[model samples]
Target: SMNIYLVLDGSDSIGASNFTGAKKVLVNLIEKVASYGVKPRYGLVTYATYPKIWVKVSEADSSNADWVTKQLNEINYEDHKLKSGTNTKKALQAVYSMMSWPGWNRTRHVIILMTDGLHNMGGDPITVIDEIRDLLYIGKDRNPREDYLDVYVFGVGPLVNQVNINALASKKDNEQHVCKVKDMECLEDVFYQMIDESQSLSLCGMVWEHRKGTDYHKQPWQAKISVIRKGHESCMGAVVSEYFVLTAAHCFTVDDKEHSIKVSVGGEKRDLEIEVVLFHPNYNINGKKEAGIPEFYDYDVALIKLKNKLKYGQTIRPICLPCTEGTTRALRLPPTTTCQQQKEELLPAQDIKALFVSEEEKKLTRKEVYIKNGDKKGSCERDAQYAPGYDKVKDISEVVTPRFLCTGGVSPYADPNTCRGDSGGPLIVHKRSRFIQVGVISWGVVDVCVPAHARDFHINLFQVLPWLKEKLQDEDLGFL
Candidate 1:
């Protein structure tokens, strides 16, 4: 769990009305981030001529996030007795002293400081930044523990000192720690850009933990998508955005009943009506029949739009999507980095350790599966050679192309075969305490999944990012 400390500049420079807005921003971030499985501990500090700590990190937890919200709501800027000077260094010093307690280095710490204008009384805050870094072993002698601590400074409004606050933030070759903002709304966009959701603090990729103690199951983002084409077929889809559900294109046929398609999120609410279903343009099930193949699940991906927007809650929330703002933040990629750079990091050359989502007793359960890598491509290629329709070819190049990823065999990994209702489900990866979708369950080689040690082909999400970016760009999904 990460401990978040929000530092506010409450003085005459920002005015009373603006101070209230800043407080609301901090409270909003605290509430959104604390709702996830990575339950956060929060602390608040506001300074002008003097620094004060209203809420300690020790007092906040998952069960008490409601209490933290109430505590921040009780604060009044007029009652704090602050004056008209900016003492940013003292505020950071107060935070450093608070972190200097016994066994402070055991957990991660993040300081998100919101300030306007320049520091008048205190000296440069960079020295206190160095002290905190040294305490975390992050300096010239690198220990690769960059995730241990982060100091994000928001230079707000037209009068902010951007250059002075830039160096106080955490440093990586391709990432940004400091941000520029106009007001509370822009603060939301900038906050999404700077904070790494994979590490901590996010509204996306959240899970419902302890569906009890021994269950060990997560099911908030899993959605059951149903359509009335000829006969009803129920497939798995993931809630990716407020207006969209992501799944495989193979679930939808040509000119299917678009009006009858409904999405059931978390299985506890009323089924959401869909406005449209858009599959990848190049996803043709029989596109390779000219090359001696009858069926091929290439570029198998789809996105459905809801008629009424999805209202997220404890049960129904959006999972993380790749090549979007959340992934760019989670992966900590450079601001200028392209989609290709992000793809390489998200889908590396090594074997990918992933979780395969399958339907069991009308419930979606997580099963661990490891996907094969670049040099070891023979496993997927050989197992797919004997698939039903493509026996005429010596190998499965046109049928199971590079656009697909294979996982399932007894070579040190458990075989989790995809059944009839399992197509279009998400194959996810968990890293840095958050979940990200990497594949969509497309086709399988098992006989109704009756036998063990069979092969399954899933569309690698990194291979079809261009199609996804174009469709989901309007839904607050910032593409890389």
Candidate 2:
């Protein structure tokens, strides 16, 4: 969704070897952009004493991105005519020339000028930069979405003209589009930030915006899980990564054979067979029998390993798992942002707007439900006492435990509620263009639903994050 002009500082002050590294940075950044579903069109402007256009944005497309990456990778500073002076002004002029292309003004523009600001060979770059900005302005006040131009100055290495670099970059009341780095490798983050701006979120947890199908397939990360036995068994799950599905451990039992299970995504006829099943090591469906809790949903989480790897698409994508680096990127939060912070923002104690899937329908649909911790956090735990097993229990904490999240009560609307088949489905919270999974549908006072005072419960994902992180570490899902 953006046309990015990468302005490279090829001056001798940045060193020939460093300049080569600069191109490598471009190669890596392009590779990342290409891998995350194509969005941005890019071009290269290498500026030394003169500016050379290595690639044109007009010539750019998703199919040609790899070709551009190859070209960037092939660049060698030793082969080029090394020149003195950072022609910062001439580089901006070249960018201005790029703006004059037929219908170029229709594209969203971003100029990333990679320079140390040693402008000794031309006029001040700020002059051309301002002229270019004015050209994008259709109105005196500049209101058109396409009229916006973001000019960023990434000053690499020492000898950076701080005042000039600051002046050349665009700014807002609270933030500046300028960064200073001591090495070319550091620019990778700057490129990532721009990619985020172009794409609302990361590769994971994306909805099918252009889908022409029924709303049944709208929850892009949802997976239909089934197991074959004497009788057919079914459940729901959330795809957390390429190799794993997060669901309820209660859906699986030690006697269940791996080959008997299968997973389906979207409307695909071919389903993936299960390679193995991973249940929480301590989960016991009947562990509380003596205490009167016959169907224990505590520690009900499980991860299903698929026999075949998943390929991400509009119909099939992984949901954002909290406390992970992927979710942090999806939320556009800094690395320092902690799991506690995410928990507070994503899962409050009361009235957490949540959705569980409806599996009884022809096509899977969502059921909106209201859950509260009951001002003092007892709405759900109090419901447990009404059950047979909890009669011997003194404290409600013995059943509700910190790891459990409550889902039901009369706060439930007059609609069909989640059924037993919906157990293990993702309890989702929509935020930042992503469905951040905060809980897993564990159990309810009633297996099937009709609006009642009975309360349901879910497993709080944040409480079991360490287990997920350990199991999913090998899958390359980023963890904080």
Candidate 3:
């Protein structure tokens, strides 16, 4: 269903033994891709003095894996012929020509370029890469690089130029498209890493309408957090990156006790271990009881760092954070923009939509996804009057502040209310066919949804952009 081309640089820089290792890595990658069940077409082009195509792009369904492996076996390091120079530009041009071959099917195209050093022979690769874009058809009108081709460049050995690799690979928030391996033996790990992220090729969001007993694979970003010690599911969270999850700060019993938590991402039943739990420092766990405040869910956002980087699939991926036109004017684009800009952009919307799961008797029974509409400036203070324990606060403003998003409870637009188990769930917005998480389900007027009477509150991510940015800034977190 997809087209994957491997461009191997068997130059003098990569000695004969290393070239063999590269071939082994390619063979393993082919096997891995075949194991995915949806076999994709495969091709190979090796470069040194020039470029040599050992195996042309062959239909995966029609071509046997053994034939591809045999073709790869036939490719040898050009010991006597054209092994001195590394013409990466010419190699890529060969790949472009292969893609243009007759009977070439239009499908997802993936090109993986592996080399040991920077381009020293032939023309500058950047110009060839630019020209290569024109050779490939992006779409009818969509020219975004993500919608069409994905180019990944892997550099090995000491002479590799990190800067040049960055320029050649696809632009990503986490710099995921580029990798630097210590030696040829580690090449297989890099190939597997790229394969793991094959499903999460784009930063744009994907969503499906809510349906009861629906599969979590349909909503890949949804995460279910559980407390292993307590032996029960604790709260909901959203996959914000491969190594981090976004949720309500109140989801944790304490800020530092994350060692006891586990997570199920992409609706997988297997629980992944959690390494660290970073809750908002401003959140007061006992503000209501100790500080004598009626409500204290304002700064209730949190982030969980996982022990292992998630292996992305069609069932799992990170959602987009908020960004604004003003940020874009500054040339700060999506996947690189901040959450502050997102709020400013959404500030003018008549209403924003969020999704969550409903509950019965404090347990998730129906498994039905609920839709709740939020207002930019609603009667949050007035709506809180119907909320339980409202009398504890001297004024309504003390409960509803700028840091909160008010929804449900008779706004007319606010319908299909959420209940207790929905805490820590994501308040998502579907924009440009992508889902952006704007709010964190923090609290509600009532523990149970009371039709037209109970308004729920969510922690505004825009208001807490500084906190989110600070926590997500770690390069290991991969928020980009």
Candidate 4:
């Protein structure tokens, strides 16, 4: 998600003559930016003697695109002739206000300021720019201690001050951010250049990244597994290594037919067949009830080796697993690699995000949902009722143990429930901007065919981390 702001100069230099062109440029820019999808929120401020906000930072959904377009079109030039001075400082302040709006998710904050000339009133714009830069610092990547302020300055006509514009714009090694245009006609071209730079394709998994349309394959990490039996029995899976896929152990039930399971990458046609399938040795669905033990689906995990090794690409890629000291060194990752860095650290009540296809018997719907974790042991054990035939267990805790992570039910965030065919799907969480699988869908309290009112259980990957590591090592699966 990103917060994009447009600060337009409404002073006399730009007011009566160039203001009309400024509005047109804004309309085009908003349309292009919003076309990126619902993740970007846009805000607008116009400054003459002072700044006037046309739009507050608001979530831009496809449904509201027409409303946003209408709002930009209706904003006229400041009519106060006597109050015509470029108050760049106040405009910057107005733009910064949006950065801390209510429910503001810490995302990329972009400010685009357009002016015909230098600041005539208010404090130095450079000082405000520096202060804004300090407030929006991101991590040290290739550009160390980089400030997140993606400021772009556009100067119109000869009256514009080149030195001030250079100082205000963001610095890059060989790139120029200060665009100089003759008129509003040229402003369109400048905006296109800015859009190209500002648009980010480096998407993190579980993060909402989509183009204008609804194509689930656009998300490369998504996968599907078809367990072809008497009929096609489909389950979800995620690529965990170049030659391995991670799914639930229950997916390979005792009754499941061998040599029939197929894996599809990125929602495409089933292309890869399974060579070897290994479910956890401790995974016993009926043994618990039959042997007078508690009914539990512990260690509900399986790793599938593809018949042919998958060539890692944009769409068909493995997700990061918990990095142990041995696995990190073996994988040749950075020496500083830690479980926390790989997002292996788990908390009791952390919020988790997930993406999976909702297989509603006949209909297949792709959905994203927020899942808040239950208590460390079992929050669902207190309120959850077992499915039919499990009444002999008497205690829900017997089923939902520490080895299982429970999530769902009506909450502040919308409830996400999975159906019959969704078993073995990756239940993921966002860690350090990337999505990492923390759990696997094991079983749900209520069947997905009916309306949802119960919590779902997933196999906690952290609980079985050592088991997974050993399995991978034995199989010679290098790294994940």
lDDT of 1 at 448: 54
The lDDT per prediction is 0.73, 0.74, 0.65, 0.64
Candidate 3, residues 1-480, lDDT tens digits: the string is 467788888877877876787677677667655433335667778888788876666554324555777778888776326777778888888877766645233466778888875667898787766766666644335545453577888776667778877787777454367766544434444444445444534433443322332445456677877764544547888887788888887777763366568887765658898888888988875676543454477698888889999866667766665553322322224455554445555444455555555434434332322223244355544667666666656667766767877666545454555655578887766443456677788887766534565677778777887777688776233332
How do the residues 1-480 of candidate 4 rate in per-residue lDDT, one tens digit apiece? 566687888777764556777667667666555443333566777787888887787544423545667876787664433455778888898876666434232566677888865788989887776666655544435554443457778786567788887888878655556777554444444444445422333222422332332334344455678776766777777777667788888777777655777787854555677788888888887767753434457788898888887655445555545554433432234667766555434343555555455655444465566455644224454445656455566555666667776666655455677777678887765443355667788887787563344667788777787778877785443434
lDDT, model 1, position 403? 84
For candidate 1, give the lDDT: 0.73
What lDDT, from 0 to 1, does candidate 2 have? 0.74
The candidate with the higher lDDT, 2 or 3, is 2
Each candidate structure's TM-score, on Cα atoms with residue i matched to residue i, is 0.59, 0.60, 0.52, 0.56
In the order shown, what is each candidate's alpha-carbon RMSD? 17.5, 16.3, 18.6, 12.7
Candidate structures ordered by TM-score, highest first: 2, 1, 4, 3
Pairs of colliding residues, candidate 2: 1-39, 292-389, 293-389
- How far residue 440's Cα lies from its native spot in candidate 1, in Å, is 0.8
Error of 2 at 184 (Å): 44
lDDT string for model 1 (319-401, tens) is 77877777665544457776777667767776778886767775557788878765665666577766787678545676778
Model 2 per-residue lDDT tens digits across residues 1-480:
567788888777888766776676666666555445555777778878888887777673423666777767776664445476667888878878767745544667878887777787877778886787677773355354433577888786767788888888876544557877554344554554455433433367666432254543487788889988878888999888888999999888888888888898867888889889999876888887666566777789999999888877657778889888777766656789988888788877567777777665577777877657447347556776765556677666777778777766665344245677888999888765567888898876655545354667889888887899889989887777
Number of the top TM-score candidate = 2
- Judge candidate 4 against the unseen true structure and give its global Cα lDDT, from 0 to 1: 0.64
Give stretches of model 1 more than 4 Å off.
1-202, 210-217, 332-338, 448-453
